[PDB]
Amino acid sequence: SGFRKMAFPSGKVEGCMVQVTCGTTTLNGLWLDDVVYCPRHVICTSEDMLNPNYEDLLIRKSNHNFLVQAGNVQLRVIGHSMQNCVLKLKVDTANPKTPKYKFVRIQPGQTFSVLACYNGSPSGVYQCAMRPNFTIKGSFLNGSCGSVGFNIDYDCVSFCYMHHMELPTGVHAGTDLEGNFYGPFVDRQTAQAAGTDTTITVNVLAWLYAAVINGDRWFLNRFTTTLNDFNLVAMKYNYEPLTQDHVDILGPLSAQTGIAVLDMCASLKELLQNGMNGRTILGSALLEDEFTPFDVVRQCSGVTF
Amino acid sequence: SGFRKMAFPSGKVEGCMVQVTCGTTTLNGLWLDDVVYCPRHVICTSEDMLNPNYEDLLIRKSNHNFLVQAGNVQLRVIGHSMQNCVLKLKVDTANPKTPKYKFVRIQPGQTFSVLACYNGSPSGVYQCAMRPNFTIKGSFLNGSCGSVGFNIDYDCVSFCYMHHMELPTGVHAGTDLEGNFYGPFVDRQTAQAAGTDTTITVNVLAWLYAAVINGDRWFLNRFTTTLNDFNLVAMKYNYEPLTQDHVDILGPLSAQTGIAVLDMCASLKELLQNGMNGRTILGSALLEDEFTPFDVVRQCSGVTF
Ligand SMILES: C[C@]1(C(=O)Nc2cncc3c2CCCC3)CNS(=O)(=O)c2ccc(Cl)cc21
Ligand SMILES: C[C@]1(C(=O)Nc2cncc3c2CCCC3)CNS(=O)(=O)c2ccc(Cl)cc21
Ligand SMILES: [Cl-]
Numbered sequence A, B: 001s002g003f004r005k006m007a008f009p010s011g012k013v014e015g016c017m018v019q020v021t022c023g024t025t026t027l028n029g030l031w032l033d034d035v036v037y038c039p040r041h042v043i044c045t046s047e048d049m050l051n052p053n054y055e056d057l058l059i060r061k062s063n064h065n066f067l068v069q070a071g072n073v074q075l076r077v078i079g080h081s082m083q084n085c086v087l088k089l090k091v092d093t094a095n096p097k098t099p100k101y102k103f104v105r106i107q108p109g110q111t112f113s114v115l116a117c118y119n120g121s122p123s124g125v126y127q128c129a130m131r132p133n134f135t136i137k138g139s140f141l142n143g144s145c146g147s148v149g150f151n152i153d154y155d156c157v158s159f160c161y162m163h164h165m166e167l168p169t170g171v172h173a174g175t176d177l178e179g180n181f182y183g184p185f186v187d188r189q190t191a192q193a194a195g196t197d198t199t200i201t202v203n204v205l206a207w208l209y210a211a212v213i214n215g216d217r218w219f220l221n222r223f224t225t226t227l228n229d230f231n232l233v234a235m236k237y238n239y240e241p242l243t244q245d246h247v248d249i250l251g252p253l254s255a256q257t258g259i260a261v262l263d264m265c266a267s268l269k270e271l272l273q274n275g276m277n278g279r280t281i282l283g284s285a286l287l288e289d290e291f292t293p294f295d296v297v298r299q300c301s302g303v304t305f
Helices: A054-059 A201-213 A227-236 A244-249 A251-257 A261-274 A293-299 B054-059 B201-213 B227-237 B244-249 B251-257 B261-274 B293-299
Strands: A017-022 A025-032 A035-039 A066-070 A073-075 A077-083 A086-091 A100-103 A111-118 A121-129 A148-153 A156-166 A172-175 B017-022 B025-032 B035-039 B066-070 B073-075 B077-083 B086-091 B101-103 B111-118 B121-129 B148-151 B157-166 B172-175
Touching (some): A017 A035, A017 A121, A025 A066, A035 A156, A054 A077, A066 A086, A201 A244, A201 A251, A201 A293, A227 A261, A244 A251, A251 A261, A251 A293, B017 B121, B025 B066, B054 B077, B066 B086, B201 B244, B201 B293, B227 B261, B251 B261, B251 B293
Parallel strands (some): B101 B157
Antiparallel strands (some): A017 A025, A077 A086, A111 A121, A111 A148, A148 A156, A156 A172, B017 B025, B017 B066, B035 B086, B066 B073, B077 B086, B111 B121, B157 B172
16 A cells, blocks of 8 residues: 555666757757757757747758767767757667657646656656646756656657746746647747646546545545536636546546545535645645546556556 | 655666565565575465564575566576575576665665566656654555665665565555664564654755745744754654754755754744645645755755745
8 A cells, every 4th residue: 555656667768868969058868769859949049049040040050069978978960850849860879778669749637757867867757747737847957958758658658748948937848759839838038927727636536536545535425416516616726627538537446446426526525615624635735636547546556667 | 946756767776676486475576786685575475474484484495496587587596595584596697787786774764766566567666765663655565575765876776675564554664675674673464563653854844945945935934943942842743853963964955045954943843833824835735854955955956046
């Protein structure tokens, strides 16, 4: 038993991290086969960041302007191209440590592991979720740009995030591995703000089921509710609407604990209207929303990679 | 910006995990150079667990009774010896993926990363602390015995924990890599219970300094305290006594933020008395004690906001 915020083992991703330098900017790159993927803002100075014309900045660069370092070895750049907000550096050597991989775009509410890197060297791994407002509450300092988010499905690494920027509120924004930003963000030094965030309802419910599996049942009650009445309640507390898809997805956890999804919704309704009253759930005084229904099933079953 | 519970990148430890089988029992082993380290209870049946005579059970075993599997390869056992509660299996192949390593015994309050494994296969990584009562609040199911705790400051892996058992309250007990248990526990199914746990005061203080660094000061006050008056109050809330060593260790964080340790102790005294009043500190409604002074310096910026 026990319930922790758990990240995937990072080893398959550590073997892909490289350092990319162009001029005075140094950031992280992802080396898969003979290509290094990194944020295209590596070609910008602080003067350019105000209003960059990325194609115009890129046309002035040659292959030898990009310095790529893998461990203590210098990789030779033999080509370069831009795809959305990501730069693709063709290198001479294929990464012998390239794992089985896919590039996947995730949806808000989905979780992933972040391997925080500085100078192409991994320093930490943590778990987080794509918020409904498309930001992530990460932990990144200067030099972390190019750090990646991923999930592991059997032996295949699914890369879903590449770090690009920090917003004024201390939250983070980035792209998928095809360079498409999550959220209405741009890679420029301009006024940008995170939108009003909401709580991931299906994830809080999954975490309530995890608490029941771990022996925390004080919040259970005899009541049930309807999906229409619960959504009228949830909308008042800045919770995301719960759909029939979310109810279907919580089916296995409902069968394991014997608590119907709308039965658990009535517990969440009472927790939202009354609070915890000095109590905790899984060592937390807040309702936790960064564990998906699948994360809960995985952690309470022991799936390996 | 941001503050997350962050684990070390697990790759260097993933390349050491093996599966160890003796009869009907199967658990995890740590393969470093030509030795596999695993809990000695791998030689026990559930009938041997009440009063096992390990020396008598071990003398009846030969090298070929121990099945060690590394990935899809069978390792040949050429020797075996017991050191305290750990079994050391001499194998015929040195692990080519052996990182630079040390075995270190940690003290209560210290944090480390746990690579949870099943059948010699890593499933997840999380951060945790050695509680004052020598237990850890982990996430471990049946088959996780032999999973290890470690730190990776610089390029050297310091192994500090090997998982052995779950106590009746759902918390976990284990040994250092020399087989010495942390706490008054035994690898025996005896009526043993964790002592009453306490909050790691020096770690809560470190985490309050992390919140100041990230730009938050709502909890500070104009008061100070003597160390003894602070300890008289702290012990009423089940907080560990703060020693002069802890005050010395908080020196760097005190210098960076400009807040004297005994002044931060005064904010802590007031937080214990008043609660948070609807507010959070670094996204938490509870006072966090699983970040050491060293973890805060490692994660946080050197420039206070
Ligand atoms: C400076 C950069 C950025 O956010 N880097 C970064 C990323 N993560 C954390 C931290 C920073 C910087 C200092 C704090 C900590 C560069 N990326 S960008 O998308 O071009 C961009 C766009 C706009 C702005 Cl205002 C900054 C940036
Ligand atoms: C049975 C074992 C144990 O706790 N395994 C285990 C270890 N970690 C987690 C989980 C379990 C079990 C199922 C749930 C989850 C084996 N280790 S031991 O030190 O010999 C020991 C000592 C005392 C007792 Cl009461 C049991 C055990
Ligand atoms: Cl220590």
